[PDB]
Amino acid sequence: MRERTEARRRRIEEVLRRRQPDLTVLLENVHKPHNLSAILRTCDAVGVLEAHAVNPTGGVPTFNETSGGSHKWVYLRVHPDLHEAFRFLKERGFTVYATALREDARDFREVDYTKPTAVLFGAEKWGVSEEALALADGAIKIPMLGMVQSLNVSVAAAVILFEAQRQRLKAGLYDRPRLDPELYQKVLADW
Amino acid sequence: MRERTEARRRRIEEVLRRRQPDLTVLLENVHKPHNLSAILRTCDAVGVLEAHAVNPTGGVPTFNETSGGSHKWVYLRVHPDLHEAFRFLKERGFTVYATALREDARDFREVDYTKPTAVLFGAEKWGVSEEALALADGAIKIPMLGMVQSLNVSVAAAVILFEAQRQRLKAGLYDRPRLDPELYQKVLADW
Ligand SMILES: C[S@@+](CC[C@H](N)C(=O)[O-])CC1O[C@@H](n2cnc3c(N)ncnc32)[C@H](O)[C@@H]1O
Ligand SMILES: C[S@@+](CC[C@H](N)C(=O)[O-])CC1O[C@@H](n2cnc3c(N)ncnc32)[C@H](O)[C@@H]1O
């Protein structure tokens, strides 16, 4: 009885209480199942409730590599195209930053991730599309101090999301629930 | 002539001038070529000169996934076993922290990465060995605020190395060269 409630029940709610409905990622054409799986695992670790994608892993979400069965816990909304994904996020109050390898992008640590924020990541071989850069509210970049031009996409997603995790921990966002009662009770129900 | 010198020559030295001889990683039994490749790409991005491993990808370093040909730039020293890798690092003044999923590990952001530091990472399916934990100077952990217990190893390596990159950028370690003349001229030679 308490194994059923004192454990599973209590730990799941504890985690649900740290879910951030206003922190997310938009994945544009991320092709490799290992990147999709690792990015969702990272989303779970920083409390992302639902992630977004356009054309993930061929068209249908496909997992394999990481995933402490992370896709079991992080919702993944797939959009028909980039404009719909942006319409969806903007209508919900998100500021959307595209990640870019351009030298004119803003340093990723200078963004305030405690505000509703969605960060867009692009295809492994060629990055965020020109279309996506045009839609975004700004472009951000992670400093590269060596010879290579870019990081693995899952890695870039983690560097940015854990800076968001750092800021929100300090700001105290994880200290109290941030899901309305209906949403909360509804996700509590699935988990 | 200037394409040969003004470009290749100048950009390579610029990067060599940011290499950190006293910041590294020790990879214990990291099996997947995509993790090894992504971790070396991350090492390049934060200025790691040489990385270390015991039993990488089956025994012989094997790359495939990431690598802006990152293995072209980051030296990888493979050791016969864990004790030799530790002897090698300790004799050189490194403090070695093991990464652990234990709840008694220190928060990774509370480590001062501006001192000579080596961070040890373990096998994808089961983590750092009990032997490695016994050898290490301390254990550190990245906060996990969701349902999953761990992050992808390459992801964990990047979260920790970019916190090191953040601290060293502030401390000004990347602002001046930190390689002795012989080492510098020698790596300059290969690149
Ligand atoms: C292989 S990279 C970009 C590749 C593209 N062929 C290029 O050379 O611009 C994949 C992706 O990496 C990202 N990304 C990689 N390194 C990054 C960095 N240093 N800062 C910000 N985003 C980064 C993008 O978001 C995108 O999802
Ligand atoms: C799949 S994980 C650990 C797996 C192991 N089966 C376990 O459950 O403890 C691979 C590895 O992840 C690391 N690692 C993963 N998440 C981490 C976190 N939150 N903090 C510190 N190290 C982490 C380790 O360094 C190691 O290289």
UniProtKB/Swiss-Prot annotation, chains A, B:
A Gene Ontology molecular function term of the record: tRNA binding
Family listed: Belongs to the class IV-like SAM-binding methyltransferase superfamily. RNA methyltransferase TrmH family.
Mutagenesis / variant outcome for changing R41K: 30-fold increase in Km for AdoMet
InterPro entries (alphabetical): Alpha/beta_knot_MTases, rRNA_MeTrfase_SpoU_C, SpoU_MeTrfase, TrmH, tRNA_m1G_MTases_N
Effect of V128A: Small increase in Km for AdoMet
Top-level class of the enzyme under EC nomenclature: transferase
EC number in record: 2.1.1.34
Binding-site positions, S-adenosyl-L-methionine: T99, G122, A123, E124, K125, W126, I142, L151
Effect of T99A: Small increase in Km for AdoMet
Additional detail: Binding of TrmH to tRNA is composed of at least three steps: the first is bi-molecular binding and the subsequent two are uni-molecular induced-fit processes.
Role: Catalyzes the 2'-O methylation of guanosine at position 18 in tRNA. Type I methylase, which methylates all tRNAs.
Biological source species: Thermus thermophilus (strain ATCC 27634 / DSM 579 / HB8)
Reactions listed under catalytic activity: guanosine(18) in tRNA + S-adenosyl-L-methionine = 2'-O-methylguanosine(18) in tRNA + S-adenosyl-L-homocysteine + H(+)
Protein name (record): tRNA (guanosine(18)-2'-O)-methyltransferase
Pfam families: SpoU_methylas_C, SpoU_methylase
Record note on quaternary structure: Homodimer.
CDD domains named in the record: SpoU-like_TrmH
